[PDB]
């Protein structure tokens, strides 16, 4: 029952301005683009980058958004966080699944009737060994909007909630509030770029006007994404939060951040320090002139026997390990305690070289802890 609606061309910029909810840019994904006065709408909720924390906004008067999904590409290869809305319940299904590209929910204009409204959500084609089990109180109840902020710090997804009834504004024009209470769901996941989930509760079989004659869609979800700032917030009586003053919004707010206070007396103040950083990394050594005499041990006319093996000592010179290792002429190289990638930074007092003649079956016996001929 999975359907695909990924053929759409969203707005390139998709940028909106938020005053204080600091003063950053949040994506304005619309997912409802009517082609002129007559045409068919297109739904598109592409997977957006997580960017270590994401804030989502509903801005729906009919609860169009029913949660969010998160995790990897969700192709039955890794665990993916899930969140869905039941009739009166909260569903968390963080597990491994391989669902369709576009999540969809079931809605058939469930008005006042004998409870015969058919619905079917296609958001989980398969289900692996689940690791999530938590049910909370569902939240369903001149404007209506809501928001939530998700942040996974590998120990607990300290979610947020903004159930305050924001109104008398187009879309977050000036928010003089700060609230983020929500129930945490501690689980072990490696959540990659996430995606939204919407319910198409706009189809009507008895519309007065054709071509989406309903009042609104309205899948206007605002997502925006985060940065590791150090904004300074002061407590409030009754445990609330009064305002939020950042330490790097502008030079004025940095003065308030270093003074640990909101007001600033007229004068001059020192906040931080500046320092230009280096761009490259250089290491210099004296010129390489006196190479080690390695020709006597690699192109010798004759070699030694087993009982009369010769000993060669190499010292008081420089030995280039890159040319010897990158020769494309040998086939056996094994040792313990050192690695070829660590040979570039190590020095020893003396190097001893030995060579002899062995048989075909006398090559595996050169190893500590073994016996042989």
């Amino acid at each position, epitope marked *: *029952q*999975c*359907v*695909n*609606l*990924t*053929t759409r061309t969203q707005l390139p910029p998709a940028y909106t301005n938020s005053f204080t909810r600091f003063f950053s840019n949040v994506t304005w994904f619309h997912a409802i683009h009517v*082609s002129g006065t*007559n*045409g*068919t*709408k*297109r*739904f598109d909720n592409p997977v957006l980058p997580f960017n270590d924390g994401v804030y989502f906004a509903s801005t729906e008067k009919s609860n169009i958004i029913r949660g969010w999904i998160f995790g990897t590409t969700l192709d039955s290869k890794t665990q993916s966080l899930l969140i869905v809305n039941n009739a009166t319940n909260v569903v968390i299904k963080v597990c491994e699944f391989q669902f369709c590209n576009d999540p969809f929910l*079931g*809605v*058939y204009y469930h008005k006042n009737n004998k409870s015969w409204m*058919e619905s*079917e959500f*296609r958001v989980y084609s398969s289900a692996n060994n689940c690791t999530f089990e938590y049910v909370s109180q569902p939240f369903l109840m001149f404007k209506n909007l809501r928001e939530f902020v998700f942040k996974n710090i590998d120990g607990y997804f300290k979610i947020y909630s903004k159930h305050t009834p924001i109104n008398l504004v187009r879309d977050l024009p000036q928010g003089f509030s700060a609230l983020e209470p929500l129930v945490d769901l501690p689980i072990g996941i490696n959540i990659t770029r996430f995606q939204t989930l919407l319910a*198409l509760h706009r*189809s009507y079989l008895t519309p007065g006007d*054709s*071509s989406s004659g309903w009042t609104a869609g309205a899948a206007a979800y605002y997502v925006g994404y985060l940065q590791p700032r150090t904004f300074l917030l002061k407590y409030n009586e009754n445990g609330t939060i009064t305002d939020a003053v950042d330490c790097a919004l502008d030079p004025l707010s940095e003065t308030k951040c270093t003074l640990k206070s909101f007001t600033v007396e007229k004068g001059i103040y020192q906040t931080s320090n500046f320092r230009v950083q280096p761009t490259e990394s250089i290491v210099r050594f004296p010129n390489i002139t006196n190479l080690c005499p390695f020709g006597e041990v690699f192109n010798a006319t004759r070699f030694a026997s087993v009982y009369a093996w010769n000993r060669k000592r190499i010292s008081n010179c420089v030995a280039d390990y890159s040319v010897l290792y990158n020769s494309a002429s040998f086939s056996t190289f094994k040792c313990y305690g050192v690695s070829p990638t660590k040979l570039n930074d190590l020095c020893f007092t003396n190097v001893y070289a030995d060579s002899f003649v062995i048989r075909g079956d006398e090559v595996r016996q050169i190893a500590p802890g073994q016996t042989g001929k």
Partner: antibody
Framework: QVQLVQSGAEVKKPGSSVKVSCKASGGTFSSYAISWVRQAPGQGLEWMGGNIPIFGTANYAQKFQGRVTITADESTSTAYMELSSLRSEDTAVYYC?????????????????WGQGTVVTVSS | EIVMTQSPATLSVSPGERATLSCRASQSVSSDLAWYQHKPGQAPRLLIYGASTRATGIPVRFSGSGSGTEFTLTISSLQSEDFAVYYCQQYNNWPPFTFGGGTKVEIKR
């Protein structure tokens, strides 16, 4: 008073691609959702896929991806379906159903109000 | 991919009698069923959509009944021209749609 006109019968050699187009006139072509149904001897009716009415996309079916491509034009009100990769069992008669009228939200797989029918045969 | 079947494969009903067609599905097909009539040399024509409501302009002889995965199609009036191939399509998903084997309407003799 809605009438659907499909393309005539054509013969396509193996290894070639054939496009079949069905045109709808006298009705809400923009609000219609075309589909493809092929019936062949020795087997039941098979539906390759269809176009979503509400959204609009080439919703294929199982064992049909990469073989049949369907595109719909709002201006021309005609849908053309292309077997590319053309074998013997693929020769059948295709039917078009644009007026999906028995389902819930986003009706699909109408199997109703079929077109005239275009005959496609594959031979050397 | 749901599986549906139509029985009997061949039915011999004399003219003026009642013809009964039984449909079944492996999933809940109480409100998801398609009935169409097809003839040789022409594309199939829809007869009943949803197994509960007859199409506009269709003959009143054709009718459908049943609940759940089982559906029954009954014809009050039997005609020689009305005798054709009928099939039931499974609509459990939106995807892929799986039509039934179909039935051949024979003349009793």
């Amino acid at each position: 008073q809605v009438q659907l006109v499909q393309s005539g019968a054509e013969v396509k050699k193996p290894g070639s691609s054939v496009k079949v187009s069905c045109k709808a006139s006298g009705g809400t072509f923009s609000s219609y959702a075309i589909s493809w149904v092929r019936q062949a001897p020795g087997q039941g009716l098979e539906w390759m896929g269809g176009n979503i009415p509400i959204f609009g996309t080439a919703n294929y079916a199982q064992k049909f991806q990469g073989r049949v491509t369907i595109t719909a034009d709002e201006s021309t009100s005609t849908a053309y379906m292309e077997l590319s990769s053309l074998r013997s069992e693929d020769t059948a008669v295709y039917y078009c159903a644009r007026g999906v009228g028995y389902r819930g939200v986003i009706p699909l797989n109408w199997f109703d109000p079929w077109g005239q029918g275009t005959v496609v045969t594959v031979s050397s | 991919e749901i599986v549906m079947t139509q029985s009997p494969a061949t039915l011999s009903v004399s003219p003026g009698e009642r013809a009964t067609l039984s449909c079944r599905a492996s999933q809940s097909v109480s409100s998801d069923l398609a009935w169409y009539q097809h003839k040789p040399g022409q594309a199939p024509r829809l007869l009943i959509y949803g197994a509960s409501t007859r199409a506009t302009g269709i003959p009143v002889r054709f009718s459908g009944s049943g609940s759940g995965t089982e559906f029954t199609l009954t014809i009050s009036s039997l005609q020689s021209e009305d005798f054709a191939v009928y099939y039931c399509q499974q609509y459990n998903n939106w995807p892929p749609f799986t039509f039934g084997g179909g039935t051949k309407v024979e003349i009793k003799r």
